[PDB]
């Protein structure tokens, strides 16, 4: 076959013989990647994409003869290079979605630069690492978000470690849209070192997160942010075996009203879970662990700080408190008119507990809200001691002498 | 019509025996074993390469010239000479294939078949690097003649990063029906490590999925650093030990954080059970 | 005393140095013997032919453990880029290594931006960097730390344009313009932020030329140039006011600090102040927009 | 690559050096971390030439390299020491005894560290690296360590271990000149990475102080700063990371720009209190009321109109600054106030480059100033003035008003 060493050479040549088969050795000169056989078509008016349809300088189309799956290398992506691969991956995904087929990405490091997000349409195609530890380096990306997932099935994203450089204003994943059926999954991905790693937007699709890691974000809500005003997002947001950890100051914040989140066998480590929705937010954690591992930090685990009729459920799992100079504040806080339900979990105790500094008395939970307990266990054999959980569980009336007298 | 696209070799032996001399030349291996039609692919001849041969992705010819496999996707065991439905021990080939796969942070796939695991050398899966995935969940591993302490162990080689980035990206084990013959002292799967290391092993988010462990002494046993493992559609049955279905011994270090099981089936009736003996352990 | 004539070599690089291991035994073995020693390697200034690649051209599947690797008593001469940093260029030490007469404007020593797993203490001891025909040193990689000890920078400019967090420390080095009439800068920290250049001891020699119409030291905004235990030179050919508008040794809107610096008060041609950031008096340039202070 | 396997050696030390070729060169010498089995002893166990150890690696001994009694000048070049058993196993200079190191690597101790315990002892490291280990100096008196062009880092580690810990004695000096200090993000840095004890000195020259969002040193110190200990810190040509999106922190108490910064006077002296027309506003010193409960604090509860507390001190170009404050808002109508830093010339004229940080509404002890109270000293500045404004109806406690202008 006539041979061309690069896409640039292939496009520059004045192809004229209809039906002729030519061989592209490589998309980029010398790399030996992305090549294949191309068929000249003088009648084709198909739009060029520099992958499956190549438009030469003279306007003649060259149609890729494909023997097998679509790879981003076919569109000019360069693995393990400093060159921007995002245009090629975006073009490859556009083709993949056009034929309702997932886009597979080979194990390597890819650099994403520029400011143009990739919007995954989960009703047509997802981006799937095939298969291993795929790294997408977005440290030089300057756009508002790297990935969005919106239609208005296979997972939308799977097997990808996506990281940035904590640049302000650059978020990792937006599920939905910035402005106002269907089910789709994000699985086996890690989001790291963005402003906000994962942010919820407007969307009618039920999202499920399986084995997703979010860590080390810049924003105080950087681990996972559900902002207020998501009226169109009525479905339950579900998380299975996800790890939210080592936030370096970033946390989880649920601010949307009438919003329900479910966490199953997840871990919240060295981060705070904030709930300040105006009304009717519900978080349920089943079999989850709340801990301060390695840092021994005194930051709160759960802070339901505002609104009314907000419910946080901790069912089973574990609450672990590593020793520090002093736990001078309550690790769990529930504000007025809100509720924290504890079910089948063991309340920890440590000698470093100094919550009286905040509350004025020795108790585990703060705030003027309500706490309920069903099947909760206390560490009665803990040598350091044991403490009561909350004021709302007081056995005795006028326990704090708030009557203004000595009645009861 | 006797012309070919690339020079063709019918077997790995013929590919190695030929005196390859043209640098950069692309040659086609029809099959690893002659006539089988498995494990073939395109190889690039390199006279400058000093890479260590592995008889799979890096082939060293008899004259010392290297042939490098053009790999698109995960590593397959048949690229290293693994044969479906054979009496020959398949563990060496799978171990060699996994060793390369882990070296390049890529999962190892195994084609649909039954394989025999013999000898006494365990396969240690590094979940921060690569998993072993049975194609379509229909891989059967016959370990009746295996005499080692454990068939599989899963433990990361890192104390923190990049294990905190990579463990979750793919399963450590998927699609494997692993069975033994209840020979004493042979355990199925070890979660974590046998002894406490100088540093901790970051195993959080590691997954065992769509696997069955059957007829071992202890089918699944927790070791040190057994934290945040998830088992999805994993079955354990017919073990020898009274704790054989699932055993968590006391004294484990850096262990106990949310060991999770989804749609798992634990069954026996012949004396084996589940026993959790480790303190500060959450399941 | 081995000489390697590469005048007819047409490859991209003559030598590359990169480990085949991600951790061990590289953590035990790299330091036991030099990677290259006693080689005078020269080319013929052929475009596209570099001398030495420190690290690798492309990111590997895994890291390459290159710490403690040594290039010793070698010269790289008349290549496109004599010495170029690649990926995994960390904790390399160059002892008595010379780079001279390179073709590229960054040919003496080039650290491009974007390198992975690189930048930890790249060390140079008794190294000589020389040219005069347009080739220079350029550090463009972020988070890159280099140490030069008793090195010579002759008829070249040391460029630092890294986006952020470059740190260059020169201990006992001499910057000189022998034989040359060029007005080129000695040190030009031209871009980025949080870049630090340290000149500790050594000497800065300024031989007479037609006229030094620009500052020989330049530190751009948000960057820092530290002068420690060094004598500021003066010459009658100093004409830096053409660039700055006033007679001073250092240009740029960055910051300069001074510790143990001496002036040539004994120089018949005169003496000049070093930098605007060291101004003794407020509103020194009437930048207040008034006559206050 | 010569390999000396000493895993079965049971003696006290493998090699000793006692009296111009190097004494050892080209040897990888390793053990099996057997207690009581050391690698290299430089000198004798019991009481004028130059000698050298080059291109050797010592690994997996109890103490890899140990100094003994000897009068010879020793130089190390390209020596690695790693993975020892003893807590001082990387390198140990015991008490009761110039030592120079060039391009040596001390790393991956897995619990082993460097400890200098000998008085009147001088150590010089050039282009060395200290990775995942601590450098202890507990000499009784007059120990000197000078690191020129070295790197201190935690590569791939979650550990909160200190980098440098000068923990005892007097007149001990540790110099860091050039090189780099790198702090990769971890679960949370809840203790200072550099520590200089009473009557000891830590000098930083021409090096950039790093910052990371995971910095939580206030857990140990009570306030947000990089270096702990009651010793002294000097800086010359030190760069602060003023454009780090996560922020910047001051370095040490000994560099406080403002007097009575911790209210250790026992009063509110050196602070100019201006209640305005709010004669009813209360501004008081409260003992044992700061973050640790062992320090002073200033409570400001203005009535009707805001109160401003300020202090001015001398400063001049060139310079860089960063300030942190500990603030506990008990109650506030809205934004509780603002901490501000301004610069003036000698004539009192205000200069550009002023910075301010709003206090917000969140209750509880918190750090103020990370990404706000920082910048470069404007040219011509002769005074620096901090002002603490508290709004009417707010009740706020202030502690540890620590500003650093890094300069000679």
Author numbering:
A (entry chain D): 16 to 167, 179 to 206, 213 to 440
B (entry chain C): 11 to 293
C (entry chain A): 148 to 440
D (entry chain B): 148 to 166, 179 to 206, 213 to 262, 268 to 578
Sentences from the paper on this structure:
Here, we describe a phage tailspike protein, named K2-2, that specifically depolymerizes the K2 capsular polysaccharide (CPS) of K. pneumoniae into tetrasaccharide repeating units. During the initial stage of infection, the tailspike proteins (TSPs) of bacteriophage recognize specific polysaccharides on the surface of the host cell and attach to them for adsorption. TSPs, also known as polysaccharide depolymerases, have the function of binding and digesting CPS. TSPs typically consist of three domains: an N-terminal particle-binding domain that connects to the tail structure or baseplate of the phage, a receptor-binding domain that extends from the homotrimeric structure and is responsible for host recognition and catalytic activity, and a C-terminal domain that plays a vital role in trimer formation, receptor binding, and intra-molecular chaperone functions.
